[PDB]
């Protein structure tokens with residue numbers, strides 16, 4: 001209730017460390033993925049994304065992005081395999097995007113910034129609840145997917161069309177029966193490394209799994225994202241754009257590739 005961080009000049013990423021010292025920690029995210037340095041790891045098991053039973057409930061503008069929330073009270077949509085030990089339950093997804101097509105993603109690939117990045121957030125069921133999971137080094141598994149501007153992503157349109165109803169911070173709308181399988185690329189090849197939440201509290205509880213294949217969305221689709229507001233209703237309008245944290249020091253970490 002007293003947080004004041006954001007993405008502006010005075011409360012942006014370079015200021016976060018004052019209230020969240022872990023911002024200068026040993027396993028912060030995002031990071032630049034150097035494709036030539038990432039090493040193929042034969043020990044990685046096949047990745048398993050099981051979203052057939054996913055049941056979405058609502059979409060919320062929280063002042064820094066919009067979250068499509070899922071009912072995680074039962075074992076439905078789960079992520080397992082790959083570098084993960086155990087089962088991780090889908091709780092929400094959201095995006096980070098830019099003011100221009102040349103920027104917006106959090107992770108970068110050989111310093112390349114994509115127009116946006118989708119984060120599907122899952123928590124380790126062995127910890128019982130999300131709140132407990134974020135206090136553990138292996139509490140969350142976040143599937144990151146890059147977005148590039150080109151052809152439209154049909155499966156994203158239902159999200160785009162509901163944004164008019166959650167323009168400002170604090171607004172929410174019912175959002176049932178949305179199938180997240182429609183946001184996945186063809187290939188599940190990925191890079192993985194141990195990291196953190198990319199927004200305060202920046203907790204170091206995430207196993208990051210970043211897909212190599214981006215999905216394509218249309219210019220009209222991302223333009224709608226850019227009409228959202230960081231501000232609440234009846235406040236000076238500040239477009240919700242460039243809500244991404246830049247790449248952080250890799251420090252003592254190795255990025256592993258699931259392929260080639």
Ligand SMILES: NC(=O)OCc1ccccc1
Nearest residue numbers: 119121142196197198199
């Ligand atoms: N951006 C980012 O770190 O997404 C992952 C995440 C996990 C848990 C809560 C919020 C966000």
Ligand SMILES: [Zn+2]
Nearest residue numbers: 094096119198
């Ligand atoms: Zn995110």
